[PDB]
């Protein structure tokens, strides 16, 4: 039972690109069907880290659930949660991915961010977030009132620090700057911790994946050895 | 002739996890047998770099030898070589991997470390080392008497610098901090150089691998093309 | 129709190692034939990034064209374009890769470099460049009159900053220092931007690749699923 998907890419589907009306009551799947030359992927162009592995850790999924992880109403009273960009306009209305929140400062200097989530779903949780990369220091200051910020993400098995690189690139969809996307799988019983002083796009929704026994570690090269074994 | 292994992972076996009584007169093997859901892997939880490739560069091995590379008695007269952690307790006794030495300072400021080894085994040598990542600056100071240190590893074909990131993670096996593992293959005739001013877990033992003709470059994706060729 | 290649590696061929007389009227190919234990690869030893993927993005190619991207005569009036090294000596004459230019300063402090190229070939363009890593600060100063420099490379889909690490390694081909190689595929209509204040080896020639329909994204793991599908 292959999952049916339109003119969108997996990145668009998982990030929550408004242009993709994929919000349907679909649970498990054996395959993902994707247009070989998709258009509706990332609203704000940029690099999607480990994109190949995310089409291998979701190549076969059992029970699949979308749930809210960090509600905008209560999670960030001291920050702006309306980082809307006309980069894309569903119904001609500027909007952002429906699973992410682009946070900015207000009144004074961007207040420090310290939040965490504990996985009590009894399933592995896929958490997605981004890092903002301004085209200019003046724009970085406009959003965060600083010229120097970092994003740190910590879990039991994954730990990385992200540094924003300010530089102007060729315009893509009229964007001079760029957003990079990162993700990790949070094991049951663990905690994901986010710490930042600016240039953070926070997770809003997260996905719980049963996975089942359709794969091994899920990583690619582990979805081939099994395919070869099946032929042999 | 598959290699028999208990409830341990390859990481545990190669690092020297005391809980794994795998110290047997075993040389060559055609396969590695590993429990699909292993428990006895890394004593001090953390990230193991390039773990998939180390189960592909050792997927098929001819002559295999464990030898001492940097003896604790003579290699570090100016450092502590007893970085024991109760993280694990063989016979209920706190101990560390039997192939690695966690070095710390003594008396004064952690003395600078400059050591090297020349490969004269006529075989490729697998060298493993780690980098310490404190949960707090106070703990970094307790061990090294500094708040700023780096680890540099240089060879003919591999050259990387490691920077420790101090941050507290969720406790794993009661550990607030974390150790990352790195490795490289040193070609015959080359030299591996270690330079550091703190936060280093030095290699103690190293492995000489004949490898033979059971693989190509050894890298994965090079252990599949050959498998497909065999089917075809 | 496999491409015939001598005692050289792909890295040597694409970089332009003088010792490799592969400058022939060869266009498309279905396979690349390479000596399993090649000798004539990189003149100045060092690390070649993403080398496996460059033997998978060129595993099958249709029309293939070598063209000049940044002519030495007009592109750098304020820099030295004769960074010759005796590392190798075709006809016993010190020379450098015939697709790269090792730039150095002159008279005063290495002038800042800002250059770009727009892809109007209607084909994907493969751009190669390098980063210099001195064995000593004194040598870095001799070439660039500085002790601190960086290289930044920006495109629509790729954006990375390179930091040189000064350290002495074991001599390889009598070289105490080392050069690392990096590359990216520039899509039609995009622009590649190079910005640096030292330690840059600039692209001189670039390749236009038709590619055709002999592969998918071209990435490895995407050249295997197709091979397995063919068997099945
Ligand atoms: C994809 O685009 C084509 C052409 O506009 C359209 O006919 C098709 O319905 C689209 N797919 C979906 C799911 O809307
Ligand atoms: C979605 O794809 C259509 C082409 O069918 C394009 O016109 C539109 O701009 C795309 N929107 C986004 C957000 O990519
Ligand atoms: C917002 O700032 C006030 C200090 O003015 C602080 O007491 C409060 O806890 C902060 N709220 C959040 C969510 O950080
Ligand atoms: C966030 O906390 C760090 C110390 O951990 C501090 O140096 C930094 O200035 C704080 N951020 C802001 C905007 O004050
Ligand atoms: C692995 O664990 C099981 C269950 O305790 C035990 O019976 C088995 O002997 C263990 N394997 C080894 C090699 O000790
Ligand atoms: C080894 O595995 C056993 C479970 O059989 C567990 O109780 C013990 O704590 C583990 N020791 C280490 C060092 O992982
Ligand atoms: C230990 O320190 C002394 C200086 O007090 C130095 O002479 C000696 O060479 C050092 N030994 C090592 C192994 O670094
Ligand atoms: C190690 O040597 C470097 C210079 O290469 C020096 O800056 C550093 O302070 C030394 N380490 C210690 C603990 O003094
Ligand atoms: C490769 O080296 C061998 C041995 O010197 C030589 O005979 C052969 O002609 C070389 N290949 C090419 C293309 O020159
Ligand atoms: C090319 O290979 C030959 C061995 O046939 C070797 O003697 C020569 O030094 C190599 N030249 C380069 C630039 O690698
Ligand atoms: C060379 O330097 C002069 C300033 O003396 C500047 O006007 C000129 O544009 C520079 N040329 C290039 C190619 O950077
Ligand atoms: C290159 O420009 C930067 C500012 O973007 C400046 O800080 C740097 O010093 C310049 N390089 C040189 C050699 O002056």
Top mutation candidate among B22, B40, B94 for ligand 6, by most atoms within 8 Å of CB: B40
> If we measure between CA atoms, which residue out of A209, A193, A194, A184 comes closest to residue A66?
A209
A198 Cβ contact partners less than 8 Å away, ≥ 6 residues apart: A105, A110, A140, A143, A144, A146, A149, A150
Give the other-Cβ count within 10 Å of B55's Cβ.
17
Longest dimension (CA), chain A: 65
| B90 DSSP β-pair partners | B93
Integer Cα distance of C223 and C31 in angstroms:
12
| A84 DSSP β-pair partners | none
Name the 3-class secondary structure at C6.
Answer: coil
CA angle B188, B192, B194 (to 5 degrees): 170
Q: Which residues of B touch A (CB under 8 A)?
A: 36, 45, 47, 52, 133, 165, 167-170, 172, 178, 220-221, 224, 227-228, 231
Integer Cα distance of A85 and A21 in angstroms:
19
How far is residue A221 from each of residues B3, C96, C113, measured CA to CA in Å? 21, 38, 41
Give the other-Cβ count within 10 Å of C90's Cβ.
14
Name the 3-class secondary structure at C225.
Answer: helix
Of A221, A231, A232, the CB nearest to B221: A221
- The answer to whether the CB of A33 falls within 8 A of the CB of A4 is yes
Phi then psi for residue A95, to 5 deg, are: -155, 170
Q: Is the dihedral of CA A18, A21, A26, A30 positive or negative?
A: negative
Q: How crowded is the C-beta side of B207, counted as CA atoms within 13 Å?
A: 25
Phi then psi for residue A28, to 5 deg, are: -75, 160
| Distance in Å, CA C170 to ligand 10 centroid | 19
Structure tokens at C20: 């490799």
Q: Which residues of A touch B (CB under 8 A)?
A: 152, 154-159, 161, 190-191, 193, 195, 216, 219, 221, 224-225, 228, 231-232
Class assignment of domain A2-231?
Answer: alpha beta
CA angle C14, C20, C24 (to 5 degrees): 75
Please give, one letter per residue, the 3-state secondary structure of chain A. CEECCCCECHHHHHHCCCCCCCCCCCCCECEECCCCCCCECCCCCCCECCCCHHHCCCCCECCEEEEECCCHHHHCCCCECCCCCCCCEECCEECCCCCEEECECCCCCCCCEEEEEECCCCCEEEEEEEEEECCCHHHHHHHHCCCCCCEEEECCCCEEEECCCCCCCCCECCECCEEEEEEEEECCCCEEEEEECCCEEEECEEEEECCCCCCCCCCCCCCCHHHHHHHC
B27 Cβ contact partners less than 8 Å away, ≥ 6 residues apart: B62, B63, B64
- Match 């939880």 to its residue by tokens: B45
Integer Cα distance of C83 and B143 in angstroms:
46
Phi then psi for residue A101, to 5 deg, are: -125, 120
| Distance in Å, CA C148 to ligand 12 centroid | 11
State whether the beta carbon of B78 lies less than 6 angstroms from ligand 7: yes
C contacts of A9 (beta carbons < 8 Å)? none
Resolution rounded to one decimal, in angstroms:
3.7
Q: Indicate which technique resolved this structure.
A: cryo-EM
B198: left (phi over 0), alpha (psi -120 to 50) or beta: left
- List the domain boundaries for chain A: 2-231
Structure tokens at A22: 């994929």
Nearest CA in chain B to A192: B170
| B192 DSSP β-pair partners | B117
Integer Cα distance of B146 and A175 in angstroms:
44
Name the 3-class secondary structure at B71.
Answer: coil
């Amino acid at each position: 039972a292959p999952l049916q998907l339109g003119n969108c890419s997996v990145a668009g589907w998982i990030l929550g690109n408004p242009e993709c009306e994929l919000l349907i009551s679909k649970e498990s799947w054996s395959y993902i069907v994707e247009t070989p030359n998709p258009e509706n992927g990332t609203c704000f162009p940029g690099y999607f880290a480990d994109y190949e592995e995310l089409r291998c850790q979701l190549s076969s999924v059992s029970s699949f659930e979308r749930f809210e992880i960090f509600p905008k109403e209560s999670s960030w009273p001291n920050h702006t949660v309306t980082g809307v960009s006309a980069s894309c306009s569903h119904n001609g209305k500027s909007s952002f991915y429906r699973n992410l929140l682009w946070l900015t400062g207000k009144n004074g200097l961007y207040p420090n961010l310290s939040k965490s989530y504990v996985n009590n779903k009894e399933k592995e949780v896929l958490v997605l977030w981004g890092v903002h990369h301004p085209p200019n220091i003046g724009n970085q200051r406009a959003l965060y009132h600083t010229e120097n910020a970092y994003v740190l993400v910590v879990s039991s098995h994954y730990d990385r620090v992200f540094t924003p690189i300010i530089a102007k690139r060729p315009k893509v969809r009229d964007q001079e700057g760029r957003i990079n996307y990162y993700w990790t799988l949070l094991e049951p019983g663990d905690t994901i911790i986010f710490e930042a002083n600016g240039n953070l796009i926070a997770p809003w929704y997260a996905f719980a994946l049963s996975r089942g026994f359709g794969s091994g570690s899920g990583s690619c090269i582990e979805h081939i050895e099994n395919e070869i074994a099946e032929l042999a």
